[PDB]
Design a protein around this ligand. Structure first.
Ligand SMILES: CCCCCCCC/C=C\CCCCCCCC(=O)OP(=O)(O)OC[C@H]1O[C@@H](n2cnc3c(N)ncnc32)[C@H](O)[C@@H]1O
Ligand SMILES: CCCCCCCC/C=C\CCCCCCCC(=O)OP(=O)(O)OC[C@H]1O[C@@H](n2cnc3c(N)ncnc32)[C@H](O)[C@@H]1O
Ligand SMILES: [C][C][C][C][C][C][C][C]/[C]=[C]\[C][C][C][C][C][C][C]C(=O)O=P([O])([O])O[C][C]1O[C](N2[C]=NC3=C2N=[C]N=C3[N])[C]([O])[C]1[O]
Ligand SMILES: [Mg+2]
Ligand SMILES: [Mg+2]
Ligand SMILES: [Mg+2]
Lengths: 528, 528, 528
């Protein structure tokens, strides 16, 4: 390697950070506390231990645990040695987990004790795995004992910046999970170029060197939104809660004085509604709600607690971060409502992102704020293709751009607002109607629990929508009333107001995926 | 080019910024005002005009003017088309300028009217130049007329990120100026990784999206410290003063409400001592004094005016930025003095910088804060070699590291303090003594104007120091008194206190280079 | 290397010559005499000494001395080891010498004692030079002492025949000197193909194995016209005079019985006009006057002394030899005058030379002897380009041919006669007039010392000529008389006879370059 030819490697994020305080703390909730010097020593020890296990540059190490110092150490030691880090979604079914393990061809598996029963249904069909390391919170952890036998000195290799570092096997609508992968260069550029955008904000929604970081995301989904890398590059204090219990989360936020975190709307709603939060000071917190479609009512309610709530956008193929809501100081004088609308949007695109809006022919629809279309992006941290896929990869990068699958409109000043998914469009007549606004209208009904809208195919009118609704306790509302209730509203195009073929139906239950999202694909098969 | 293979190009800094306000202003002092949309249109127009002139990817365009919107437009249009941008140091002698022009083989020269007489001494010996464009501040500017005939639509090329973009021909101690060069990738990484460090500071010395930028640097030295790129990436307001007159500078700072600037100690001293600054509010200003060795007394005096003064470090081979003074909130409670010492240091190394201290055998001396040595660095934005040089290039990158030429010590917490130059070391006996502290001691004398210390070679004691001093008005102090005056001080090692062979001498004048720096090399030849 | 694949190397010129007499003498004037066996031993010793100094294949060794056995030994030992030989023009200014040394990046410098003061003005700004060897004519020479410590046995390497051997940095009209370079193959082909032409002449102007060679050229200009190589290949006696004093030159010619030499018109005129030459037998001498434009009067005067005077042509980019005057036995019966005209011409092209005449559009003007045009040549010993130059190199080889810069006409039988330079053409009207014939007409005036003609630009008539003349002692001739004196002559085209805008002016002095040639470029700037 030419010393004058600089390679962008993950080890430079750790050993050449923005700031490095040797006495800054890393805290695993009520279990462990150490310093950044101890963290570096443990990273070197884990590198030595992995080298002893026969792990080489091309190997793959799979991880299965919660959010802890161990996961943070795996985020660095495994990529630095050159091997690939496979984050297993522990929320998938055991069959899908087995498929992902077989597809990735893992060599070492680091699994928490609480996930052992799942492995009990899968270990029999697992090949290519030579060692299982059981992680525990007590003294009998195999990871800690393996660390104890190794020295704290290690000379980390130099390799090409285009070597793969992480894979985590997203699961969309394909029938099988799809492998996504990133290199050292992409991760370094991601953290650098998002720190250069979020950190340069004037007064709102900025992460700086004086914060205290705390993930409330699974940390195996999308690299925990890349935020652990940014937090360790800033040399900030990091707190890891573990199993995401609302009471212990609130206690940790109070005691550790957490000021920056990121979350999904469900856990945020559970922490705001907790009785322990009624007498808790929240005017130092900077939650980023970028999971999926931060509701306006939840954002308002959180703003009344003096919480800096803003939304971000990701995909799991795109870094993941593509856009973040940033408010100008003029926009910070709005009272509670216009701020609620602005903060719940998709946000403006981050540095080094193109983010055009196109249609089915890739025609780059204008940014008038009313014309909806698919989002299509270019960024320095996108997956070139799906692992071991050809035609899905070709469909992913159709037309020289990465296809997102989200239908949105971009307004004049640049604010993005996602309206629907590509596959969930009611392509009624020749128009493209979104099923989200119909669901929201029907959800507002007093005697309605959950609403799902499905496109029923027609001879004419293209395909028409069919509504599936679940009622509340001791509630019995006829189908005609629900049809009429939607007809009450106004401001809809096409035939009258798209209220002639709503076809609302009662189901007792609505099918959901293993994560808890409405499985519209299975709803089709059941009803048509 | 593979669309999934992202190239780091300068056009992405302009068209994919952190923030973009179309109505944000670019102001050339009392001459011109336009918006960012107009700036983009003018960049496209200049691209068209350069294309009409026959400028191709491998061509070189040389620029000679002050700080204006024209220089900012040249910072973008010329690199985007692929050609190289040659910044000519207008402070050099005409012979050195001719040498640099001949060495770079410029094709188009953009020269201000006020620099025409210099070209009158050099145009006769100039080859390879096919067009001269005369820049004026009035309506008769050739640049403006060339812009007026072109359209505001242009499709910018994609090329490799390793294509050269800028050259500016630094002049150290070589006998001839040395060519330095950078690529698109290096500049993009420089701006991104310095925004990610300076912008993430908690409360002190940060540049954010609400500032107002104003260069007080020649803008041809080192890319104006790379700050125009950072300012345009943030979509901030930029003000360009022109000829650097203290009165107009103060007027511009007052009227335009400038909050961020960078400067050298001389211009800062002239703006603090100006009578117009006595009744001027300076408590919004964030000068970065990284030119050369910000004095402690000047920093104190500036701190009493409530100015956020801090120092940075550069070389002209290194991006240039390598280290910046950053203060923790604990350090911000010091009154006026300890803050003066901290703010005048070289500073801590920025993100993605190694910055070891070594000796003549490259042994990596420890960071105890007392052991001095040469600074040696690795960074993503260093020059691989000197242009059209082999052995100077080999000496630049000796031992797999870039050699700086500065002798400094690094303390425990990471603060760098530069003590001297490599070639200005009194290698007395076997020790390495710095000539800066001897100059400071002799400069403190009441009847002393300027002191230069030169190493006179000895048979034994290695080489001994010889002092050249200029006296003040109506001052006549004997050599013996000056020798005794230095002997008064204490805390010096080696023989007694290195006061037995000071060899102070009176000169009437001391030779200086074309910039205004003491030319120690010529002092040798004159005296030995 | 394949032994059946023969490489044309300089070592074959020495070790496989046409003739080799071990007892043949090499004489340095009144200082040293040795034999060819001693010369070979000294070449091997110098190879050993250079190897001890760390000189490798890619290194460069620079030489600065007069004509001696040392220069002849450097002509062989340095190229044979593989390194490049840099001949420094000691007649240049110290600044130009410094520029050439820095550009060539010399490692070892061999400098005569008498050239030490020049180095005293330049050594301070010299880099890349690790050793200085001082050459002396006494016993204390460092070169001789270095030779004395080495053995006379050495095995010379085999390398590609396209490896560079010599560079000498010609200085035309560029603003900076231009680097020219040749390979082993080119030098071997040059000596072979010029020996095959000049040696095969019937009775006049031939160099054979019975001659005695003596250079009267600086020996650093153009390889001394390549004649030392030819002389050592023939195994002939060689005499080196040193400092070119006319008295010692005549004494050496008389005592050593020199029969072949080459010279420039100035030294020839000084040796013919010397009082010691009045009683000296010159009917064995074969001077080649190929420096610049052998005058007809000087050639006549030399022919009355029974000297075989003939002219040759070179450039310093072309081997240098391109054409030599050769007389058929029919032409040898002319009395004194027609022989004077024939011998002073440029001559017929030598073997393996194309030598067409072209115009500004490269149209290959006919060889009618009246139509003038630029000389354009192809030969096996031309420089492919200028060292470290791109656009000057492109202009040198424009149109697939090497551009000479001389304007000449070629007659039917093949005789070339150079009329002017390309840049010195009065492009009056649409015609191309030569300034040499106007200078000759004005020089003939009794009260005229030196005449220079410069083209003054006009609105119409293209550009008109302006004459600068210096008068003799106690001579005062009005401008009108000089204008009328030129009008007396006849046989000139265009308007009347190109006598309406002569614009003769008196200067006291006329600027000359460092060599002693009229600097027309500076004359422009002074007068227009
Ligand atoms: C400056 C230092 C501090 C930096 C702060 C970092 C901000 C991070 C903000 C959030 C990034 C979003 C991360 C989510 C990644 C995707 C979640 C994942 O597990 O992926 P999956 O493929 O299952 O789902 C992707 C899918 O979700 C939808 N979606 C995601 N975010 C959305 C928002 N904000 N709004 C609407 N929809 C959103 C999309 O359908 C996407 O394709
Ligand atoms: C058979 C064994 C014996 C061989 C005899 C060898 C015959 C050698 C005859 C002479 C060759 C000419 C050598 C001169 C090389 C050029 C001199 C030099 O130092 O180059 P520079 O670039 O300064 O000048 C080149 C320039 O000079 C003019 N010029 C040269 N020769 C000329 C003649 N004969 N007539 C007119 N002009 C001449 C040209 O302008 C040329 O470009
Ligand atoms: C975040 C956003 C914002 C950003 C900001 C930025 C900052 C910047 C700072 C500063 C940097 C620096 C620059 C400078 C460069 C250089 C100059 C030039 O021109 O160069 P040259 O001439 O080559 O020089 C170099 C030298 O100098 C010196 N220095 C510098 N600096 C310094 C010094 N010293 C001491 N201190 C300091 N600071 C050295 O010697 C070098 O080498
Ligand atoms: Mg996804
Ligand atoms: Mg420098
Ligand atoms: Mg020449």
């Amino acid at each position: 390697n030419d010393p004058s030819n600089y390679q962008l490697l993950i080890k430079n994020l750790l050993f050449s950070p923005v700031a490095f305080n040797p006495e800054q703390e890393i805290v695993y909730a009520n279990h462990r506390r150490h310093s950044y010097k101890t963290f570096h020593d443990r990273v070197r020890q884990f590198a030595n231990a992995l080298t002893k296990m026969g792990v080489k540059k091309g190997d793959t190490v799979a991880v299965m645990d919660y959010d802890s110092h161990r996961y943070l150490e795996c985020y660095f030691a495994i990529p630095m040695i050159g091997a690939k880090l496979h984050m297993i979604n522990v929320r998938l079914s055991p069959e899908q987990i087995l498929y992902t393990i077989d597809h990735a061809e893992d060599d070492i598996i680091l699994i928490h004790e609480e996930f052992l029963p799942i492995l009990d249904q899968i270990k029999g069909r697992i090949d290519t795995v030579t060692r299982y390391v059981v992680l525990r919170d007590d003294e009998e952890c195999e990871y800690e004992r393996l660390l104890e036998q190794e020295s704290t000195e290690y000379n980390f290799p130099d390799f090409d910046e285009n070597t793969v570092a992480t894979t985590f096997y997203t699961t969309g609508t394909t029938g099988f999970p799809k492998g996504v992968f990133f290199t050292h260069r992409q991760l370094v550029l991601h953290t650098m170029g998002i720190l250069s955008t979020i950190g340069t904000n004037a007064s709102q929604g900025r992460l700086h060197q004086g914060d205290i970081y705390m993930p409330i995301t699974p940390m195996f989904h999308v690299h925990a939104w890349g935020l652990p890398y940014m937090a360790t590059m800033l040399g900030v204090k990091q707190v890891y809660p573990g199993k995401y219990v609302p009471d212990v989360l609130l206690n940790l936020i109070e005691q550790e004085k957490v000021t920056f975190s990121h979350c999904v709307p469900t856990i945020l709603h559970l922490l705001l509604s907790s009785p322990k939060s009624k007498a808790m000071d929240f005017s130092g917190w900077k939650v980023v709600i970028g999971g999926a479609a931060l509701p306006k009512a939840l954002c308002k309610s959180a703003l009344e607690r003096d919480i800096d709530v803003f939304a971000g956008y990701g995909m799991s193929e795109t870094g993941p971060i593509l856009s973040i809501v940033q408010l100008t100081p003029e926009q910070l004088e709005l009272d509670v409502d216009q701020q609620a609308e602005y903060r719940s949007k998709t946000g403006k695109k981050v540095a080094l992102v193109e983010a055009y809006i196109v249609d089915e022919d890739m025609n780059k629809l204008p940014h008038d704020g009313e014309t909806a279309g698919e989002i299509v992006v270019r960024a320095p941290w996108l997956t070139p293709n799906y692992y071991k896929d050809n035609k899905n990869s070709k469909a992913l990068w159709r037309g020289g751009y990465l296809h997102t699958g989200d239908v949105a409109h971009i307004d004049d000043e640049g604010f993005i607002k996602i309206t629907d998914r590509v596959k969930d469009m009611i392509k009624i007549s020749g128009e493209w109607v979104s099923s989200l606004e119909l669901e929201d209208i029907l959800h507002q009904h007093q005697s309605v629990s959950e609403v799902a809208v499905i496109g029923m195919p027609h001879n004419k009118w293209g395909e028409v929508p069919l509504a599936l609704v679940t009622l509340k306790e001791d509630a019995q509302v006829t189908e005609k009333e629900l049809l009429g209730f939607a007809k009450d509203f106004i401001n809809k195009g096409i035939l009258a107001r798209e209220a002639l073929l709503l076809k609302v139906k009662i189901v007792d239950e609505i099918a959901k995926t293993s994560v808890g999202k409405v499985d519209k694909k299975e709803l089709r098969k059941l009803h048509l």
